[PDB]
């Protein structure tokens, strides 16, 4: 059962935030809440549609 | 109208390499603030807001052309002396005085982390309110969360600290501009 | 078909409502001798029907008063003493919102008895007058929550070219209609407020932005204010008592 | 479409969607909040009751 | 599309209520810079 | 449903099933046991006496 592994080994580097000034892409960081995904929607709330 | 103004004829692509037409852009942006010395750290809440001093978070700059702000706010954080730290949240009633009691003994949200692997710590901060909106600075909710950060032992050290809009974040009303200095200091 | 014995075994299912609150656990028997008729006939003039949604919109009078030459102007700009002592700007009058109405008006102070919470949406008029030969300007605009965040804030955004990117209107006294409309959305963290106590939020503002002028020295000119309620959305039922705030306790 | 969007593990692309602009003044325009809108993607399970809300 | 005279030869046939009472003799004219919303969703128990 | 799970890679997926609701008190309920039920999937196997059982 205990088959063998072949795979490949494979290079990395150890670059722990990439790109923070950067407006786009990702946020990386753990929210301190219950559900790894917290959201609300801005959009509803708002004094005009624009 | 009698205007002489006849449209623009220019490329977009030949002269810098991106263009943006949004503050929110520039928000998620991450940027320092000041420097915590000592065991009894304080970071701003998601109130944010009314920094003394000169130096400031480009969000913290932004933030005075509007009056109410809605979502979570994210944190990195960098450690002087390297080792282990620990981040929970807390509250105004949520503090005991047993002395003997400590941050851990609430059984909130947690997290460790070793920094000697991992220098730079990343949080983000959740939105906790009653209220569909805040206005900015607002004290009608004294029991709102605020972080806490503690190295076990409570020995003392400083933090390099920079924050950003969560992506959940927003602004509005917009009430009209603050005085601010643009140049550099003249004289000594 | 049963005697029915004093008090034992009534039914037990029974409910039903007396007036547009109070249940009531068990019916009234409408037995009596005679039923009687409204006898009078109307034989009147007609006049309009009245609302409660209807009589809350009524426009109210909200201020009166002269105004002239030697008041001050707004200032373009701040110095020190003045900027860091969070300095605000003069003006002819301010008024708070919704106070000067609900508490204001004893007419809508008695239209709100026994009703716990409520929304509103404000509109206003200006109406000056004076000769034709004068000269002026005036700015009616609406600074924000305001009080409810830190002094600094309310105090750095006075100055001319941040009081005309507020919302509001202008009066040039060229225009034949001389009045004005301005128009104000509810605003707050709180979805509701008990209309009597000190729920004070927006407080409008009237401000020269043009001293007035005309051919001997000291002329004046006379203007009024009104307001009136829109949108409105009252609810729930209570005392009639001023509330309390969080950290105190009843 | 956060799911997807690290699923795919490229920053660029972050969820398509084209917004519907108004008051264009010189060929620039002002994009609706309701349009900008994305989805949330756990409110689904929540009205649903998707068993992982009850942990089993 | 004619200079406003300041009131002189203003219209005479101009009547509009404001509230449920009281009728008025002159329009107001709705000019503003930003015409803004309700803001808050309701987000509570119903009541009658 | 776990190899799945794991192989996709994502947190939030953690396996679909869509509960039994009951007792509903006010647009609010208890889901049955009974259908919260998720696989097991060695199960399967031993019943079904695959090869890597004996480790060949």
Avoid at chain 2, 6 to 24: A, I, W, Y
Avoid at chain 2, 32 to 55: C, K, M, Y
Avoid at chain 2, 144 to 166: F, I, K
Wanted: aromatic letters at 8%; a negative charge; hydrophobic letters at 35%.
């Amino acid at each position: 059962s205990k088959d063998r592994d072949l795979s490949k080994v494979s290079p990395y580097e150890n670059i722990p935030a990439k790109g923070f000034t950067h407006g786009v892409g990702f946020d990386y960081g753990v929210p301190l809440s219950l559900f790894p995904d917290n959201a609300i929607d801005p959009t509803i709330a708002n004094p005009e549609s624009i | 109208g009698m205007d002489y103004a006849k449209s623009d004829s220019s490329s977009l692509v030949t002269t810098m390499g991106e263009q943006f037409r949004s503050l929110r852009m520039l928000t998620r942006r991450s940027s320092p603030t000041d420097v915590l010395t000592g065991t009894s750290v304080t970071l701003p809440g998601i109130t944010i807001g009314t920094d003394s001093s000169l130096r400031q978070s480009v969000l913290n700059i932004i933030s005075y052309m509007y009056r109410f702000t809605k979502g979570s706010i994210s944190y990195k954080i960098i450690p002087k002396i390297k080792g282990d730290l620990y981040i929970t949240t807390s509250s105004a009633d949520n503090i005991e005085l047993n002395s003997n009691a400590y941050s851990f003994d609430v059984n909130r949200a947690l997290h460790y982390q070793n920094t000697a692997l991992n220098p730079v710590v990343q949080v983000s901060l959740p939105y906790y309110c009653p209220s569909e909106n805040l206005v900015i600075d607002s004290t009608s909710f004294p029991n709102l969360s605020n972080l806490v950060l503690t190295n076990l032992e409570r020995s003392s050290n400083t933090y390099t600290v920079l924050v950003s809009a969560g992506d959940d974040h927003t602004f509005s009303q917009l009430a009209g501009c603050p005085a601010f200095t643009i140049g550099p200091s003249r004289s000594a | 078909s049963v005697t029915n014995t004093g008090g034992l075994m009534p039914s037990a299912t029974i409910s039903n409502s007396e007036g547009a609150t109070m249940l009531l656990n068990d019916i009234p028997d409408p037995t009596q001798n005679v039923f009687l008729s409204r006898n009078v006939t109307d034989n009147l003039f007609e006049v309009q029907d009245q609302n409660l949604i209807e009589s809350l919109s009524r426009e109210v009078l909200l201020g009166t008063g002269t105004w002239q030459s030697g008041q001050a102007e707004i200032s373009t700009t701040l110095t020190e003493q003045q900027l860091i002592t969070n300095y605000e700007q003069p003006s002819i009058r301010q008024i708070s919102l919704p106070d000067d109405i609900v508490k204001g008006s004893s007419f809508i102070a008695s239209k709100l008895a026994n009703i716990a919470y409520m929304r509103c949406d404000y509109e206003l008029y200006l109406r000056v007058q004076g000769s034709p030969f004068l000269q002026g300007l005036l700015l009616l605009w609406n600074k924000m929550n305001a009080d409810q965040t830190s002094k600094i804030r309310s105090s750095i955004t006075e100055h001319l070219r941040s009081i005309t990117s507020f919302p509001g209107v202008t009066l040039n006294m060229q225009s034949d209609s001389r009045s004005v409309k301005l128009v104000i959305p509810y605003t707050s963290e709180f979805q509701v407020f008990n209309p009597r106590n000190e729920n004070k939020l927006n407080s409008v503002r009237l401000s020269i932005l043009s001293a007035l002028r005309g051919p001997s020295t000291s002329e004046k000119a006379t203007y009024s204010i009104m307001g009136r309620m829109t949108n409105i959305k009252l609810y729930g039922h209570a005392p009639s008592i001023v509330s309390l705030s969080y950290p105190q306790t009843e | 479409d956060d799911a997807t969007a690290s699923q795919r593990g490229i920053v660029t692309q972050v969820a398509d969607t084209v917004s519907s602009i108004s008051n264009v003044v010189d060929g620039l325009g002002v994009p609706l909040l309701s349009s900008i809108s994305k989805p949330i993607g756990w409110v689904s399970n929540v009205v649903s009751n998707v068993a992982s809300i009850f942990g089993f």
